[PDB]
Amino acid sequence: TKKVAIILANEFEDIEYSSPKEALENAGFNTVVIGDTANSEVVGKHGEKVTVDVGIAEAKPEDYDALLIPGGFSPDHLRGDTEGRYGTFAKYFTKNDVPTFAICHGPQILIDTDDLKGRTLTAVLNVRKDLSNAGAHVVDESVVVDNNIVTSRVPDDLDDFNREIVKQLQL
Amino acid sequence: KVAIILANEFEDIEYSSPKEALENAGFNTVVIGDTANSEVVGKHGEKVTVDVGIAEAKPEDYDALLIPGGFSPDHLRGDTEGRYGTFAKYFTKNDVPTFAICHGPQILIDTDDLKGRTLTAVLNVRKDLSNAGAHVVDESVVVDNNIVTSRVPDDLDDFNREIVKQLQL
């Protein structure tokens, strides 16, 4: 059975957690929330409460078949980790070509892998310049697939995003 | 007169504290935002009235630019037209005092004028500043000619000292 790590801090955009989670689960995959502390609670921009399953210190990235990075201000919070642990975690996925799904601000964490040069991604407008400065080829499309990396921009893109992330796990 | 570019979810004290330091030193501030006479609200609930809409604002009107942090700079970088980056370019291009704290330096990324400049910021945005070509350091306040930057609210005494000193020169 295949399972997806979702990295999550406070002030995630609620629907960018719940909608991809539901799409993945509907296709028969399971999801695990990775955050600062196991059994702590993180709260979305619009109040959705999510319990963290596994702490970032304990998580083994090789256990997971894909990584999902919801947007909102959750990725900016994750990037405040003093030891940079979420960028390091994400680096397993980009280095080993494991399916990697990020929507809106989500691709901010991918900058911290240093693995973006020459990769093709989209994101929310707010972060596109930072992605381009990280070396990516940045485009403006509802969903972009570059081998293992699937990116989208905004919550309106979720239907396209959810279709592609599920396909990529079927491989 | 100092332009303050401001959206919702600014870090409250990074607006009020430099504003008061400037006003104490006898300088005036003008909040520039999406629409004149709207309110933007800080992370901790502070309400600030927007003086001038970004459509009408003329950067040459101003003696400095102040960019408070929190998630205000990220909101400003969402402007469909990129108008706040364009506003900021005037200050970087013409070497006009430019003050940014915490996440505030994110807006300076959009000027494309950070190559070889020396800045600090909150940890969360340092990689992006480095990727923009800045020399990023970890200090309570950094002065690089016209650009003054700090990291977090605790730095405010130092930040305020240096931004006031710029305007006095």
Curated annotation (Swiss-Prot), chain A:
SUPFAM superfamilies with a match to the protein in the record: Class I glutamine amidotransferase-like
Residue stretches making up the PfpI endopeptidase domain: 2-170
Any matching Pfam family: DJ-1_PfpI
Record family assignment: Belongs to the peptidase C56 family.
Protein name: Uncharacterized protein SAV1875
Organism for this UniProt entry: Staphylococcus aureus (strain Mu50 / ATCC 700699)
Lineage: Bacteria, Bacillati, Bacillota, Bacilli, Bacillales
